[PDB]
Design a protein around this ligand. Structure first.
Ligand SMILES: NC(=O)c1cccc2ccc[o+]c12
Length: 209
């Protein structure tokens, strides 16, 4: 059972700007997604201090980067707090509306797309390199869900029957045909070292078979 939703107009406008604007410094997408993972890991870690049972779904707090040239996907996996169905459908986009407006005004005043994370809407920078983004997520208080969008104004949400995750979030980037450099080990290593060197969780870059 697949539900289809419309993005808020302001978020659809943000995604169109990210897709259409000429901007060569695309590599910052990875910093933004790793930052989001780090925030999600901080959240479950903090909550576990007053309720240790929140880690019954997995004690390890980490980030994995998994390239797959056969599928042309780059997957960012974390074992953070995860997202509820309400987060996916409504809560995150509601918060993003104000950050989007501020980001838009900053761009008109001379900011550039690399500053997107300072406005809290860094997730959407995934569309600098991905034609489709799939998010698999599991929060302790909800079921495992798959969110997906190829932009164009709509996204889908369905219950996920795949491999159970325990807890956390998997962001699967279906890369554009000309963005396959982000599947190369040396390129990902370079980007992580440049932009994400002090993240406080182990980042494992998987090797292709
Ligand atoms: N906005 C976000 O920070 C975000 C992060 C991860 C997955 C998502 C899925 C749908 C909407 O937002 C998100």
């Amino acid at each position: 059972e697949v539900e289809t939703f419309a993005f808020q107009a302001e978020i659809a406008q943000l995604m169109s700007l990210i897709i259409n604007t000429f901007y060569s410094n695309k590599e910052i997408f990875l910093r933004e997604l790793i930052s989001n993972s780090s925030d999600a890991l901080d959240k479950i870690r903090y909550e576990s201090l007053t309720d240790p049972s929140k880690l019954d779904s997995g004690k390890e707090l980490h980030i994995n980067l998994i390239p797959n040239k056969q599928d042309r996907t780059l997957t960012i996996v974390d074992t953070g707090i995860g997202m509820t169905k309400a987060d996916l459908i409504n809560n995150l986009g509601t918060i993003a509306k104000s950050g989007t407006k501020a980001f838009m005004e900053a761009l008109q005043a001379g900011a550039d797309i690399s500053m997107i994370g300072q406005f809290g809407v860094g997730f959407y920078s995934a569309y600098l390199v991905a034609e489709k983004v799939t998010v698999i997520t599991k929060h302790n208080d909800d079921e495992q869900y798959a969110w997906e969008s190829s932009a164009g104004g709509s996204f889908t949400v369905r219950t996920d029957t795949g491999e159970p995750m325990g807890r956390g979030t998997k962001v699967i980037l279906h890369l554009k045909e000309d963005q396959t450099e982000y599947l190369e080990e040396r390129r990902i290593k370079e980007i992580v070292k440049k932009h994400s060197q002090f993240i406080g969780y182990p980042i494992t870059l998987f090797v292709e078979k």
